[model samples]
Target: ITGRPEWIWLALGTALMGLGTLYFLVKGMGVSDPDAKKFYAITTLVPAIAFTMYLSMLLGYQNPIYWARYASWLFTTPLLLLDLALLVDADQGTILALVGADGIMIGTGLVGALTKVYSYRFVWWAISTAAMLYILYVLFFGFTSKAESMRPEVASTFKVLRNVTVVLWSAYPVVWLIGSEGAGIVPLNIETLLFMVLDVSAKVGFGLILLRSRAIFGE
Candidate 1:
């Protein structure tokens, strides 16, 4: 533990999460659908990038380096949105809007991390929060409205998955609020632990859920 015990602990946790995801993807490699394959492939990447981020942080770089972690989201988030977009019968524009909002959410957070000015960083975090809220609005209301004509099974799956996603994703902003980036209400160690927990639930558990849906539906 390089004086920053949180970094080493998080590194270990993320590696374990990554390994588990790798095992799942390997076991489920029999899928033939293009979209399903894309989902599984990106799921595999989430942990690998997270593990790399934590390991890099473990080296205790003196600069603000957490922005590197957002690189993972930039690639994976759109794939998940695509999963929802296609499944729910969403229009291309609506789908693309959600995807763009996700980019803002992560992109702003990265800038927040890189920034030294307190007020400026908070502004970025605030913008990121707004983006997340918009994503939820689109998923629950917009997607649901359009997806009603889809097969009952597909509609039900989207509802369940979107609910899980909303719950897990909401936790991120709360953590950020109390984390170093926001109100600084929690120590770095606690924030790191909370973040890793949420990350595992959001990425790993969500991927498994997606796989389960794929098995149930032909997606």
Candidate 2:
């Protein structure tokens, strides 16, 4: 019941996220711009939130379906989107739309994971995927013009960070399909490993990349 390989993965995720939170806090100290400081705060909180949920899982507070993961996503995904939106100084409408679609994506994903019926699960999955596609659409097409009009360095930094978001985020649905939640082709331990890596990369790695940008920090 305890100290399984899956539990180890959860513990590792928790530790890494904790480190990420600390790193962001330290790096954020030098930021003079209040707007830029918001990025650091959001990035720091992303991992901090992950740290909490990963700790919860490592502590054996989990269900067969693992609602805690979805719970983390519900909050963190919007924060991640908000980070990106603020980077480009996106309008309130755009920001709200992005977060709204993300809410649907994470919400339905939880529903699909919890649903016992096979056909109904796929239906929810389809809805979630559609919501994800809308998000991707906004990321790829909607933000480009706005990002381009920014200072060249800011624009370039945004490109790198956004591409990182796109690539890592696209992998989640695939993992869901092949893992315990969908087809059960992957063992639970391996599924945990896969998600652990992805989550750390998406949250911690993303913050590192963004925070390292000279354009954002002007160092």
Candidate number of the best TM-score: 2
lDDT of 2 at 204: 97
Q: Which segments of model 1 are wrong by more than 4 Å?
A: 2-4, 33-35, 59-63, 214-219
Please, what is the TM-score per model?
0.84, 0.94
- Model 2 clashing residue pairs (backbone): none
lDDT of each structure?
Answer: 0.74, 0.86
Q: In model 2, which range of ten residues has the least summed lDDT?
A: 58-67
What is the overall TM-score of model 2 with all chains considered together?
0.94
Candidate 1, number of clashes: 0
How would you encode candidate 1's per-residue C-alpha lDDT over 68-187 as one tens digit per residue?
555656766776777677676578898778988998998898887778777887898899989999999888888887667777777777788889889988898888888888878998
Give the clash total for candidate 2: 0
**Per-residue lDDT tens digits of candidate 2, residues 85-180?**
887889999899989999899989988888878778778888999999899889877887888998887789888888888898989898998887
